[PDB]
Amino acid sequence: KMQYFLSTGNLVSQSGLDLQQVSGYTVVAEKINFYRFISHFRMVHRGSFFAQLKTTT
Amino acid sequence: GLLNLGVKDIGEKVIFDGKPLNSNSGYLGNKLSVSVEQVSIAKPMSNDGVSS
Amino acid sequence: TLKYICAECSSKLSLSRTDAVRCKDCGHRILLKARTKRLVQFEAR
Amino acid sequence: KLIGHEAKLLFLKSFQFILKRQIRWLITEMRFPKEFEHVAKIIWLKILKTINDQPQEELKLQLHMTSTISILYLASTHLSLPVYTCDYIKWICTAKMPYFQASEILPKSWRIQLPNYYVSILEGSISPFNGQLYNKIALTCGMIHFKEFFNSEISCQGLLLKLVMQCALPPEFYFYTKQVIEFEETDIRNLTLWERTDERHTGRVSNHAELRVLSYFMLTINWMLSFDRDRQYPLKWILSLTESLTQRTTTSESIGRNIVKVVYPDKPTSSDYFQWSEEETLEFLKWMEKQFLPTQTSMEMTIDQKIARRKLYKIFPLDREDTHQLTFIEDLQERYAKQTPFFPPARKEAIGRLLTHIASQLLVDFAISKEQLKDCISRIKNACLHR
RNA sequence: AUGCGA
DNA sequence: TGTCTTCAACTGCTTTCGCATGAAGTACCTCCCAACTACTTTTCCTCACACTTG
Ligand SMILES: [Zn+2]
């Protein structure tokens, strides 16, 4: 179950973990460049749900 | 570690087999408390042909 | 003699259609196909 | 993987094979030219002759572990090169024969030739009990009609020599016993190998010549010793021949007899097992690290079961994590000197003391019968008193 | 569908 | 009897065009499979007792 969820990033549970989305939590390390590899672990996302918002505030 | 606190927080899940006994008819007398005490994680290993 | 190197012991070997795909010297299950004396032409650019 | 007639044919074949391998080590060990080789061939050619005749679906043949040496024994007797007990002890001690394990062959494949009420039963099933050793030599003679075919069977003035030197090399006892043999021992005539005991009950008629030779040997010592009125053999002399003997190293021989003792049979040598005079202990482990390797080579097992095994041996690795010991006639000489000092109820006891010992020795090389032996003894005892 | 190039 | 008014629920959309590279669900069930060990299987081998003898 944790390989599947960790292989798709569609985390679903009976509480929703109190999180605004049920996908997108996981990303490919995409080692095409050392810059990209180190940059992945210093990247932080405001979350997809705010990506859906039309505003910019 | 955080995971053992989590399993210490999930506590128990109780189920009564409808303890027939023939209070013994609405107090059942059939308690089953299922829980998880510890959670262990082991480093990756592979044994082939199984165990042996 | 065709060759296959064990990915984890370096030991050279020569697999056959009649043996287990495993390093007979270590027991690994991953084998690199060895390079041989085979002609390849190259334009020097 | 073959059952029935053709399964038998290669069980036949394999039997064919190992005997031949047996014979050539025979030549290397004894260097007894075309002669030893060809007589042995036709002997089994003769043996094969009969197997074909009662064929149809006759499966009584598959020879025993012993039939092969009986064959080589019969052929040698023809040639009259040696002896049985000596041959057997030598063979066990040096594994000269491939007799013990049947994996050799050239079979790899004959091995797989499945077993078919056969091939698996071949090569190294068990070690001989009592006559059993001959309980087939006679049968082979039966199959062979060997006595008519081959000259001078069971004979050998060499077994007598082997026997006197065997221990109390009392030079005079050679023709003492040769003389009693001369006497009533088949009307003063060299004992010939018994007949083709055709009957399956294999009665103990004791005609196995040697068995009687050893019997005359023992008797001779007892009688001659019992009545040496002139007192040619001193009271204190008899036990000396005992003290000197009771064990000792062996320029190969005694070490061999230990190796035969270790068939742990009727417990006459079992304890020798226990005792095993220090080094005897050591040269034993030497002969195990050399001739036990003739041991073996699990199959497939992903290399796994095997590798692990290799590692384990990698582990205890070991095998080393006057040339000292002496030859046969050296030991023989030195105990003949250890008795160097030659020139009532007690001596009788000493004599019985000594006879039990030889009974141990001669009996131990052979199928014994801690009484057939003496049954045998009893027999000629009876034979004798018709003067 | 995710990330992404213009 | 006839006509009018507000609110809340429901409908349909709100950048284009392509690479990648497709992968992964899953309870309930399992019969098949691989295993360790023991037990069992087919052919073969070899000795043995009694009655009677003299
Ligand atoms: Zn390896």
The CATH number given to whatever domain includes residue C5 is 2.20.28.30
Residue C32 known to bind ligand = no
The span from the CA of D25 to the CA of D23, in Å, is 6
Residue C21 known to bind ligand = no
Under a CB-based contact definition with an 8 Å cutoff, are residues C22 and C11 in contact? no
Technique behind the model:
cryo-EM
DSSP letter assigned to residue D180? H
Task: Report yes or no: D321 at the C interface, CB cutoff 8 Å.
Answer: no
Structure tokens at D82: 């040696």
Nucleotides of E under 7 A from a protein CB: 1-3
**Secondary structure in 3-state letters for D8-20:** HHHHHHHHHHHHH
Range of the domain at C23: 1-45
Under a CB-based contact definition with an 8 Å cutoff, are residues D18 and D102 in contact? yes
Q: Which amino acid is at D356?
A: T
- List CB-based neighbours of ion ligand 1 within 5 Å: C 6, 8-9, 23, 25-26, 28
Structure tokens at D182: 């001369």
The secondary structure of D33-100 as a DSSP string is HHHHHHHHHHHHHHHHHHHHHS-TT-------HHHHHHHHHHHHHHHT---SHHHHHHHHHHT-SSTT
Residue C26 known to bind ligand = yes
Q: How much distance in Å is there from the Cα of C22 to the middle of ligand 1?
A: 8
The span from the CA of D365 to the CA of D362, in Å, is 6
| β-bridge mates for residue B13, sequence order | B34
The span from the CA of D79 to the CA of D58, in Å, is 32
The span from the CA of D378 to the CA of D114, in Å, is 48
The separation, in Å, between residue A28 CA and nucleotide E6 C1' comes to: 24
Under a CB-based contact definition with an 8 Å cutoff, are residues D85 and D210 in contact? yes
Number of C/D CB contacts below 8 angstroms equals 12
Give D264-269's long-range contacts (Cβ < 8 A, gap of 24+). D265/D127, D265/D129, D266/D368, D266/D370, D268/D360, D268/D363, D268/D364, D269/D364
Which residue of chain B is at minimal alpha-carbon distance from D302? B49
Residues with CB under 7 A from strand F: A 1, 3-4, 7-8, 10; B 49-52; D 3, 8, 59-64, 66-67, 116-118, 121, 130-132, 135-136, 200-203
Helix axes D137-144, D33-53, angle to 10 degrees: 80
Under a CB-based contact definition with an 8 Å cutoff, are residues B51 and B41 in contact? no
Under a CB-based contact definition with an 8 Å cutoff, are residues D184 and D384 in contact? yes
- Cα torsion through D32, D37, D38, D42, rounded to 10: 130
Structure tokens at D252: 């190969």
* Subunit contact D302:C20, Cβ cutoff 8 A: yes
Under a CB-based contact definition with an 8 Å cutoff, are residues D14 and D119 in contact? yes
Overall domain count for chain C = 1
Q: With beta carbons under 8 A apart, name residues in chain C contacting D303.
A: 20, 22, 24, 27
Q: Which of residues 9-48 of A touch strand E (CB under 7 A)?
A: 23-24, 27, 48
